[PDB]
Each structure stands twice: as C-alpha cells, then as structure tokens.
Amino acid sequence: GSIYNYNGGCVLGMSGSNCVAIACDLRLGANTFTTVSTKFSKIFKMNNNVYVGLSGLATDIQTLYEILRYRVNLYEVRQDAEMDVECFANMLSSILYSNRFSPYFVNPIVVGFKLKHYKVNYEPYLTAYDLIGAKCETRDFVVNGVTSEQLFGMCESLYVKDQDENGLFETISQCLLSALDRDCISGWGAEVLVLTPEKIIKKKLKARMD
C-alpha cells in the first residue's frame, strides 16, 4: 500500500447515453508528499473505442501501457481490424495475472464502447481491475487509485443513469474534484475525456493545486 502512496493518483470511468467518460488526476508524486509533475496523464488511448486508465506506481504505469500498446498493435495489424473492447479487457486481465506473484503495482480501468454491428450500436463498456487481473464489469461507474473510497462515495451519491454528454461531463468532473479535494497525495489538475461514437472531447479542469 505504501508503494501506491509513493506516487498517488486515481482514475474514474462513467457512462451516459451513447457516451462514456474517463477522468484522472494529473499529479506525479514522489515520496508520497512531493509533487514533481502536474501533467502526468493516467489515461491512454488504445484505439478509438478503447481507453485505459492506469493509476499506481508510475514506472509500472508506463511499463504496462507500453506492453498493452505492443499487444494491441500486433493484434490489430494481424487481424486488420480494431480490437474489441472486451477482448482487450480480457487480455489486460491475462497480462496482469501472468505476473501473479511479482505483479505490476497498477490499478487499471478500461472505458470504451462495445460495438454490436447489425449501422452499428455503441454500448458503453466499463471495467475496473486489481493488480492481479480480477475484473469488475459495470454499467454506471468504475474507480481505482488511492482515492478509491472518496470516488466510491461521490459516485454512489451523485451518479445519474442515462445522462447526455454535458450531464455526464458535469457529473464525472464533480465526482472527481470532490474526491480529490479530500486526498493529500492526489490532484494538481484533472483531465476529463468524454467519448461519443462521433467525437472525443478532452477537457482540463480548473482544479485545486495544493
């Protein structure tokens, strides 16, 4: 647990109607109390329908992201198609478990769209992981990081089913900001990505910097 306090950070996923959002704090801690960076994004785009949020030890975040990018790129070049979000989620579980006894100290979430080709229907997809690859498929929200308890409280209290993109943005941003304001080792900025089948909206929140 102290390893997870070394850097800090958290990630949050939320779904609305034909939209899904992923948000993270921007701090890179060191020694649990020293802020060394304020632009360290925990959100990574695997493909247009698959994002991953990686909280935890920054070295393990970068390493796991590189492994996942390698695997996704190989899969998609071999298949000549975009990787389905569920296949990616299962793959991430398998990669994390392959290190079951010397694991990556990461707390991932996966957020994206499950495509169901008839036109195409875009069903929001959310999953939270533990460091050895246990999975929690969800429809409303997912959380991970040292701020997990605060995010859980905020989401359980504020989440509203079937919100449009603007309502989704306001809700996820409020949940993230309120949770971060109670954490000593997280914050220093927030990035919010709101996904729709047509566009991605990237926002940086005017957040607390202490």
Binding site: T35, D183, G189, R208, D210
Partner: protein, 211 residues
C-alpha cells in the same frame, strides 16, 4: 503543514496554512495553526495536532498564572524555556511538536523554535512542517529586514503558497498575522490557495500549468 515567521523592521510576520491530515486523508482545511499564547506572544502549530494544541494551551495557563503572580508580562525567552523543559520531560514518549514562539517584550521582538526533542533555538527567521524547506527557500531568496508591512505580508503569502504547491501535506488557506509592539493584527484571516495559484503561477487560466 507549513508555518513560518520572520522579523522585519515593523515587527514579526507569522504565516501558516490550514490543512490537517489523518494519514493521506485531509481531515480539515480550516484548522487554526496560530495560537495566541498571550496578548503579545503567538504560537504556531506543526506536527501532532493534539500535542501542539494541548501544550500551547497549557503554556498559556502557566503564563497567565505567572503574569498574575508577578504583575508583569513574561518574556518570549522565558515562555520558550518553559515549553522546551516541559517537552523535554516527555522525551522518548513520542510527542510530535514543532512550535515557533514569536512575540514582543521589554527586550524587543523575539522568536524561538521549540520542538518535541527539547530543541530551543533563538533566531530571526524560522519555518516548520513538511513544507518548510520550500518556504525557507522562498524567504531566503527574497528576505530583507527593511521590507515594509505590505512587502513582508506579500512575501509570507507567496512563501506559504509555494510550500502548499509543492507539499501534499500543506494547503487550504493562508493566514498572515502581524505582531507589533501593542499586540498583533490578522492581516489575512484566511485566503484559499486555490486563487493564489491562478494568481501567481497560471494567471492566463487557458491550459494546465506544467511543472
């Protein structure tokens, strides 16, 4: 936590943040880290909240009794000696106390640092808490004994802000008190550092600041 104090030509500036933590969870952002020991002596709290509060109120009681008994105002040096002896008596018990005692007395303006290990150091410029190295660097970089009150207050505010910016343990509000010959004034009762960041570091507010 970040507390600091320094002498200048019009007296003593004392500035603190207002965050309290339980582990990495922020218990409060409105705690009061400057405690009036008496009409002319202010104490700052760093470290354990209960220890600082209890022993500074206990010192206040002792000083009240002394000043009734002897019909005179205690000196900052005597108050600091009393506190340091009391704390040294608890050595090895695990008290966490970082305290700066500042005040005016018949010997002029005085300032002492007292910690739980019994340390008692006279000086003209101190900082305690997790964020105290940052406050130190800012103050030493921009400290002049001939600053006016406005410059001294501005410098204290900026130092506290930078400490809270770099230290996860410090934040909330900045309070800047001014100690002078006839007591003390609260120049800044409490100002959220939120506005301070978008005032000093990122006034444009058009993109995320990059450390």
């Amino acid at each position: 936590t970040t507390t600091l104090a320094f002498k200048f030509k019009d007296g003593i500036i004392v500035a603190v943040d207002s965050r309290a933590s339980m582990g990495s969870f922020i218990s409060s952002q409105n705690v009061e880290k400057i405690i009036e020991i008496n009409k002319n002596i202010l104490g700052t709290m760093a470290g354990g909240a209960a220890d600082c509060l209890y022993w500074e109120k206990y010192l206040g009681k002792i000083i009240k009794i002394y000043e009734l008994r002897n019909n005179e105002k205690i000196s900052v040096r005597a108050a600091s000696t009393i506190l340091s002896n009391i704390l040294y008596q608890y050595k090895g018990y695990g008290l966490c106390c970082g305290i700066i005692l500042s005040g005016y007395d018949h010997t002029g303006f005085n300032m002492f640092y007292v910690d739980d290990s019994g340390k008692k150091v006279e000086g003209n410029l101190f900082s305690c808490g997790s964020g105290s190295t940052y406050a130190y660097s800012i103050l030493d970089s921009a400290y002049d004994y001939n600053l006016n009150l406005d410059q001294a207050v501005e410098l204290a505010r900026n130092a506290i802000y930078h400490a809270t910016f770099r230290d996860g343990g410090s934040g909330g509000k900045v309070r800047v008190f001014h100690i002078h010959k006839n007591g003390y004034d609260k120049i800044i009762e409490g100002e959220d550092v939120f506005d301070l960041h978008y005032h000093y570091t990122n006034p444009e507010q058009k993109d995320q600041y990059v450390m």
